[PDB]
């Protein structure tokens, strides 16, 4: 709701260009963040427009980090740096 509140700002200008990043506990809800996107439930989170534009971020994207750091621990340290 607030993201949509920010997108509907009006000062003099419009608030659509304002940078917004939103945490989501459910990756499905990303469809409501933007209106130009083609709402395809089959499409995974990474292919969604808000995620591709760097305006949405869930924690499911960090689930593969377990496998990534199992196959190579060093990369995790890189993130820690």
Partner 1 sequence: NLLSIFISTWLTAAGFIHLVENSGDPWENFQNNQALTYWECVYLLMVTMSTVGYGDVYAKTTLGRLFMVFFILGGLAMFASYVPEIIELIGNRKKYGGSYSAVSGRKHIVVCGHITLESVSNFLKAFLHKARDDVNVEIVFLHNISPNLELEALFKRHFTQVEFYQGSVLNPHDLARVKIESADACLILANKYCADPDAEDASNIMRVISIKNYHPKIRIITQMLQYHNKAHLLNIPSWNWKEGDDAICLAELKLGFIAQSCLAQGLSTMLANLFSMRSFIKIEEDTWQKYYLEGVSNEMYTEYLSSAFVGLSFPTVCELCFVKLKLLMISRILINPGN
Query: 27 contacts which partner out of partner 1, Ca ion, none, CB within 5 to 8 A by kind?
Result: none
Does residue 49 interact with partner 1 by CB under 8 A?
Answer: no
Pick 35 or 72: Cβ nearer Ca ion = 35
Half-sphere exposure of 23 (CA within 13 A, CB side): 2
Does residue 27 interact with Ca ion by CB under 5 A?
Answer: no
Does residue 39 interact with Ca ion by CB under 5 A?
Answer: yes
Structure tokens at 68: 């990534």
Rounded distance between C-alpha atoms, residue 21 and residue 50, angstroms: 9
Rounded distance between C-alpha atoms, residue 9 and residue 22, angstroms: 17
Does residue 41 interact with partner 1 by CB under 8 A?
Answer: yes
């Amino acid at each position: 709701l607030a993201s949509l509140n920010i997108k509907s700002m009006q000062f003099d200008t419009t608030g659509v260009n304002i940078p917004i990043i939103t945490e989501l506990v459910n990756d499905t809800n990303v469809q409501f963040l933007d209106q130009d996107d083609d709402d395809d439930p089959d499409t995974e989170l990474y292919l969604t427009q808000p995620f591709a534009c760097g305006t949405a971020f869930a924690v499911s994207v960090l689930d593969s980090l377990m496998s990534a750091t199992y196959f190579n621990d060093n990369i995790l340290t890189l993130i820690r740096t």
